[PDB]
Amino acid sequence: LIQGELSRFF
Amino acid sequence: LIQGELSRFF
Amino acid sequence: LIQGELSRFF
Amino acid sequence: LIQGELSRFF
Amino acid sequence: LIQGELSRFF
Amino acid sequence: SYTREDIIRIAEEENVRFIRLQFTDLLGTIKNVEIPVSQLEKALDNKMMFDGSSIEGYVRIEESDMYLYPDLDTWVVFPWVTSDRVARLICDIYKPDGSPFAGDPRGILKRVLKEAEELGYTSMNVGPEPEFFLFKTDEKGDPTTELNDQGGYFDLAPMDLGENCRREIVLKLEEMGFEIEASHHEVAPGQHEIDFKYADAVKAADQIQTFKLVVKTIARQHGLHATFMPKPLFGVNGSGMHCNQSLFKDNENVFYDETDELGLSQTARHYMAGILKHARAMAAITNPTVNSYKRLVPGYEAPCYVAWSASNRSPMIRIPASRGLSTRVEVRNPDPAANPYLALAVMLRAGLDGIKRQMALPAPIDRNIYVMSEEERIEEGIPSLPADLKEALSELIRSEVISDALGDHALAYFYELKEIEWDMYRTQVHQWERDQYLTLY
Amino acid sequence: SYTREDIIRIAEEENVRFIRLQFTDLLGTIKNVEIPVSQLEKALDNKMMFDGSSIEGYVRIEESDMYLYPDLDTWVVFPWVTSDRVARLICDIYKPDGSPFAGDPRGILKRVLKEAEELGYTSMNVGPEPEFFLFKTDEKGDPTTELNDQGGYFDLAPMDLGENCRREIVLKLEEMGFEIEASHHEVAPGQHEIDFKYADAVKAADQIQTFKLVVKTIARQHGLHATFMPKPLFGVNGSGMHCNQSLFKDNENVFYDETDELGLSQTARHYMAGILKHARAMAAITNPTVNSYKRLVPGYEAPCYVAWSASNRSPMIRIPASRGLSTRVEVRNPDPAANPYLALAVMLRAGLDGIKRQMALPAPIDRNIYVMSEEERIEEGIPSLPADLKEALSELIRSEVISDALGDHALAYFYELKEIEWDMYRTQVHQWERDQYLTLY
Amino acid sequence: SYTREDIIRIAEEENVRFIRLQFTDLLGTIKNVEIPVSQLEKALDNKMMFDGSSIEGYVRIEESDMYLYPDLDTWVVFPWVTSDRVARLICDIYKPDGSPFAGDPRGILKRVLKEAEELGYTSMNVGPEPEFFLFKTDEKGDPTTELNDQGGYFDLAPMDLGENCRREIVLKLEEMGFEIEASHHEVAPGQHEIDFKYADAVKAADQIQTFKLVVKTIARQHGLHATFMPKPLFGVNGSGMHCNQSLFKDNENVFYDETDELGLSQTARHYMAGILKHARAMAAITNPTVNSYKRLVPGYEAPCYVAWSASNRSPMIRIPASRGLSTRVEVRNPDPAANPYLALAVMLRAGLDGIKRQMALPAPIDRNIYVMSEEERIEEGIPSLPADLKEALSELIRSEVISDALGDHALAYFYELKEIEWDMYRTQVHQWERDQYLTLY
Ligand SMILES: NC(=O)CC[C@H](N)C(=O)O
Ligand SMILES: NC(=O)CC[C@H](N)C(=O)O
Ligand SMILES: NC(=O)CC[C@H](N)C(=O)O
Ligand SMILES: [Mg+2]
Ligand SMILES: [Mg+2]
Ligand SMILES: [Mg+2]
Ligand SMILES: [Mg+2]
Ligand SMILES: [Mg+2]
Ligand SMILES: [Mg+2]
């Protein structure tokens, strides 16, 4: 879930 | 019959 | 049929 | 005879 | 005739 | 509105030199026949002939003859023409005998709207939410893999990142006659969304086509590349085209019911049930490309299961909180790559089929995330959307309801096109395979 | 129209300094004699002498003396001359004794039209479909292998792809005096077909020549290269010159017959039968180059068999759905490399010969694709077009009907030209041979 | 000669580690199955199996199983192997039931020789004259367009041009057991010829195959490229494979007749007549490639007409001045690209057909050069060879005499291969076409 949301750390 | 039309994939 | 065989022309 | 004009092929 | 023979001038 | 005399008047006044007789093929591509202004009267008399087999795409087998019937209400003059003004008209395709062509997507949507009117529903009000990505170009003018910015959801970067080539698009659309609601930055970097006000289905689809063309042109002007690819990049959010629908009967919203607990009439519930039961069959039309099913993966807000809710991670159908005259049913499967006419036609036909048979609405899904096992999912009766284009095509073939919506002629050609596309895709050897293998084996 | 006094009046008013006395040789190349405006009266008095043997091309053996008879109706002033205006006149070639030259293609077409008028047919209405490829140029301005764009059938790209160098061409043509019907992107990438309204045969051929010249000039202006080569690239669609023909007798279409099932008169059927019977003989004129027979290969919509149909993949003769005063016979063999005057002359003569002998029209070909074996094809009596220039030349020599259309003088010189061309082509060692062999053997 | 025990003895003595079981396909390419020395006894017992469908080339449809029957007399050890010695054996192809494979070219030649022996002719003595070109290579090791030298007919440039990579080829062949007659520079620059002493037909074909392989290997060693292309360059002489033939009956030359004016027996005249009538049918075998017919053009000593003469510019059959046991019939049509087994088989079969029917020899042509018109040529009954591969294939199909020489299985596959080759060739757009056109049109 929220994979594209957590892109700021990646 | 249709061969020249399929040039978009080629 | 014979697709990889006719590769000499391609 | 027409060598001068046949220059298009040459 | 002798087209390939006269190649020395060409 | 407009009339023949009005069109001639603006054409003479605006110094319009060239007219585009626009139409759409089965794949949603915008096609046109360029026309000098001296042929405007002939065009307005519905006397222009063209191939017509160009609708079938690359699977056309024989050349036909069809007439272009321009829609006078679609007249507009492009703003960037500058020196030599260019205008456009959106036309319907007619056979020489006088009957409309069965393979024209606009005619398909018109026919579905007519059979909706046969049940008393005067209009179908549609509001789409198309999203797009902006990519930087290279010296040759080709799109690179770098986004134009790195913003987030509803971010604000006034200088060159937040709005940039989005303010200009909205301004040009407003000058073009569009009714823009709002614009904002989307979740993924380089992703933007512009919303229009709601309009009738045919007008909504025409506006979608014009919007895509205008966005692409203006992005090209700013040295950028705009794409409506469903999933241009892996690991980031895809682009969807959520469609908000509401049936109307004499400016009365038939979806509204103040007495209902959720403010939803029985008609609306039947509509949603019909859309839910036929979802897997419509997937091939609303998600037509191979790349469309790379978007339908969990974790990126795209729907992956056939279910409805008022609040969830990613339901197939969402019901916005607005009530009264603005009560709507939002379908979130479609991506901007879909044909607007065909997608709206199949969604409306599925809803009408639900209405006709008084289909029973399944229970909404609660905050229960789908981390549950497949046994839990099929125990609760939650279907899943097709995993790729092949499954969607098989479901399309097996369906007798939305295949009737497409009609006999368009169904065969769409199936041939998508079968060829899938066959070309499935035999490719991708770089991912050469990365995993070629060393380990 | 125009008169001598009118021509002098515009020449003085427009500040025309130079006049091109244009004519055409047997290969379709546009030739001219440049003239200062001070010699306009002498030119209009039909008193200008020139070689006249330049019609024969590179096989001319002796210099003659011949007069130019300008056609006043062909007067036009080029728009790109700017500073020093240049005008043109299309002239007929006359022997010094006063009789027209038998080797002039325009005279040949006029003679065939005269013998048509002897049967009561006042005019031959012709509308051609000349398609061309737009290639890119290098620093020295030489045609490269890269196309100007990668578009498809009726593709729309307002930037510089679908239209690109086409709007300016249409504008220039219209200004000169061309009635442009419509323009669109052709199937193969970098192909843009501009269509004109129908005109009489001589006017149609003059317009074809002027159109080719104007397209080449405008394409060169934009740093592009325009070619009417029948098959510039392998594996993509070629360029054709489909000619739509209808015989007229005092503004009455003699091809029309409301009582007929297909709306075709017996005269039209005899015309089509005559064209079908002599097709292999006219192939050397309508497809005059070696490259012309690389287009006549299956799978690219070009005709390969002598047959007619109302709807087929690629018939020799197609009948459009239009009826009434616009009923036409479309012949799809010719390519733009053909001489318009000679092609129209031989097609009209074959049709008139079919009318004279009351030939029986063979049965149309159905949706039966020609995947059938050669035994099926010659069992059904379906002839095939010549496979190369040599076969076409042999058929031309053996034919007594269209050789009479060409005449005795033009036939010998055309045969000599094409024989020399074929002999030069057949002895070459191409790169394909060096790729296949030179390592295998 | 050799025996099983002898072969094992040399293999152990010479430290042979690898053995090539060589055979030939229908296109004349040398194919092999590599074998470790530990499998030598199994190979000599005729027990190795392989596909066998590899004979058909790229038109093979199903995998078969076939046995290799090595010919012990063909044993030889390559000299360049150095460290790990490699030997070879030429094998015949046998079906699993025990009968020879009908599609094996060596078996075809053996069968034709057997039916010759049935008429009392014990052997057919054959001496070929294969010519080849030497090209300089680039850094990557690919052939360029520059010849290795610029010598002429029988020229002498001892340093690096005249002999160059020809002395070592002769030396290596001599060490291999070849009987070399003489070597000289050919007419065209970079062209060389090496002649062998006469041998029986099967041995002659085996020697031709080995000679081609050895020449290619040695040329590659010297940083050069050797090709047996019939016409690698335009405007210079091509490469031929003149075949000198004489029938023998118990060490007696049946072609010799001291009483005859020309010293030719009636048997020899019947042989020549039979070869002459079936010339156009054999052309597809003796000239099998597309490039083969670029050599058959006038002015470069290649034959172009079906006629015989003791002294002429380009006769199809030449009779050398030698008499007695060396009276021969020289056939000059074949090029080195031809399959030696098939070419010898079809020539011998045509000659035997001439002998059987007591065919009448047409009159020899005098010093009358063929500058005479085609009317003179067909008035004198002088046939011409096919102008391209297509005509030769049509004649091959139409012929019942040499198609029997090929047999039912080999004819179909050879015809399929050649149709595919011609079809790929005929649709190409060559650079010559883009040079002539693309500017003029
Ligand atoms: N609404 C959002 O937060 C974005 C939705 C997401 N882009 C999709 O493809 O569905
Ligand atoms: N009409 C078309 O679709 C194109 C015709 C095709 N280019 C030809 O050479 O005939
Ligand atoms: N001197 C010769 O006979 C040369 C013959 C020529 N090389 C050929 O290809 O036939
Ligand atoms: Mg959104
Ligand atoms: Mg939404
Ligand atoms: Mg066209
Ligand atoms: Mg056409
Ligand atoms: Mg020699
Ligand atoms: Mg010899």
PDB file of all heavy atoms in Angstrom, chain F residues 8 12 31 73 102 289 313 354, unseen atoms left out:
ATOM      1  N   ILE F   8     -20.350  30.309 -41.624  1.00  0.00           N
ATOM      2  CA  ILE F   8     -19.799  31.058 -42.748  1.00  0.00           C
ATOM      3  C   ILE F   8     -19.407  32.464 -42.317  1.00  0.00           C
ATOM      4  O   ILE F   8     -18.370  32.991 -42.745  1.00  0.00           O
ATOM      5  CB  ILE F   8     -20.811  31.079 -43.909  1.00  0.00           C
ATOM      6  CG1 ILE F   8     -21.080  29.657 -44.398  1.00  0.00           C
ATOM      7  CG2 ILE F   8     -20.300  31.939 -45.048  1.00  0.00           C
ATOM      8  CD1 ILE F   8     -22.270  29.543 -45.315  1.00  0.00           C
ATOM      9  N   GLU F  12     -15.570  33.845 -42.599  1.00  0.00           N
ATOM     10  CA  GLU F  12     -15.168  35.029 -43.351  1.00  0.00           C
ATOM     11  C   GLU F  12     -14.558  36.086 -42.437  1.00  0.00           C
ATOM     12  O   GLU F  12     -13.555  36.716 -42.791  1.00  0.00           O
ATOM     13  CB  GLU F  12     -16.365  35.599 -44.111  1.00  0.00           C
ATOM     14  N   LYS F  31      -8.405  11.622 -35.969  1.00  0.00           N
ATOM     15  CA  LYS F  31      -8.155  11.697 -37.398  1.00  0.00           C
ATOM     16  C   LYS F  31      -8.935  12.861 -37.991  1.00  0.00           C
ATOM     17  O   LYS F  31      -9.968  13.271 -37.457  1.00  0.00           O
ATOM     18  CB  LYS F  31      -8.542  10.392 -38.095  1.00  0.00           C
ATOM     19  CG  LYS F  31      -8.042   9.148 -37.392  1.00  0.00           C
ATOM     20  CD  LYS F  31      -6.527   9.096 -37.389  1.00  0.00           C
ATOM     21  CE  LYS F  31      -6.020   7.671 -37.320  1.00  0.00           C
ATOM     22  NZ  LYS F  31      -6.507   6.858 -38.463  1.00  0.00           N
ATOM     23  N   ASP F  73     -22.265  22.503 -33.700  1.00  0.00           N
ATOM     24  CA  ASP F  73     -22.018  22.957 -32.339  1.00  0.00           C
ATOM     25  C   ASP F  73     -20.578  22.751 -31.896  1.00  0.00           C
ATOM     26  O   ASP F  73     -20.173  23.322 -30.879  1.00  0.00           O
ATOM     27  CB  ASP F  73     -22.958  22.236 -31.374  1.00  0.00           C
ATOM     28  CG  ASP F  73     -24.360  22.804 -31.400  1.00  0.00           C
ATOM     29  OD1 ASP F  73     -24.502  24.025 -31.612  1.00  0.00           O
ATOM     30  OD2 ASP F  73     -25.321  22.029 -31.213  1.00  0.00           O
ATOM     31  N   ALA F 102     -22.042   2.011 -38.696  1.00  0.00           N
ATOM     32  CA  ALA F 102     -22.125   1.268 -37.446  1.00  0.00           C
ATOM     33  C   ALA F 102     -20.797   1.208 -36.705  1.00  0.00           C
ATOM     34  O   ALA F 102     -20.791   0.970 -35.492  1.00  0.00           O
ATOM     35  CB  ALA F 102     -22.633  -0.147 -37.712  1.00  0.00           C
ATOM     36  N   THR F 289      -5.098  -0.901 -23.644  1.00  0.00           N
ATOM     37  CA  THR F 289      -3.720  -1.181 -24.013  1.00  0.00           C
ATOM     38  C   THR F 289      -3.114  -2.248 -23.109  1.00  0.00           C
ATOM     39  O   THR F 289      -3.681  -2.628 -22.083  1.00  0.00           O
ATOM     40  CB  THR F 289      -2.871   0.089 -23.955  1.00  0.00           C
ATOM     41  OG1 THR F 289      -2.404   0.293 -22.617  1.00  0.00           O
ATOM     42  CG2 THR F 289      -3.682   1.290 -24.390  1.00  0.00           C
ATOM     43  N   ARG F 313      -9.460   2.454   0.023  1.00  0.00           N
ATOM     44  CA  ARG F 313      -8.182   2.578  -0.667  1.00  0.00           C
ATOM     45  C   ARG F 313      -8.369   2.833  -2.156  1.00  0.00           C
ATOM     46  O   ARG F 313      -7.954   3.875  -2.671  1.00  0.00           O
ATOM     47  CB  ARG F 313      -7.345   1.313  -0.453  1.00  0.00           C
ATOM     48  CG  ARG F 313      -5.848   1.462  -0.703  1.00  0.00           C
ATOM     49  CD  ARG F 313      -5.324   2.836  -0.348  1.00  0.00           C
ATOM     50  NE  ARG F 313      -4.050   3.119  -0.996  1.00  0.00           N
ATOM     51  CZ  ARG F 313      -3.458   4.307  -1.004  1.00  0.00           C
ATOM     52  NH1 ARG F 313      -4.007   5.355  -0.413  1.00  0.00           N
ATOM     53  NH2 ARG F 313      -2.290   4.446  -1.622  1.00  0.00           N
ATOM     54  N   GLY F 354     -28.263  -3.052 -15.883  1.00  0.00           N
ATOM     55  CA  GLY F 354     -28.554  -3.213 -14.469  1.00  0.00           C
ATOM     56  C   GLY F 354     -29.913  -2.664 -14.089  1.00  0.00           C
ATOM     57  O   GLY F 354     -30.642  -3.271 -13.301  1.00  0.00           O
TER      58      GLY F 354
END
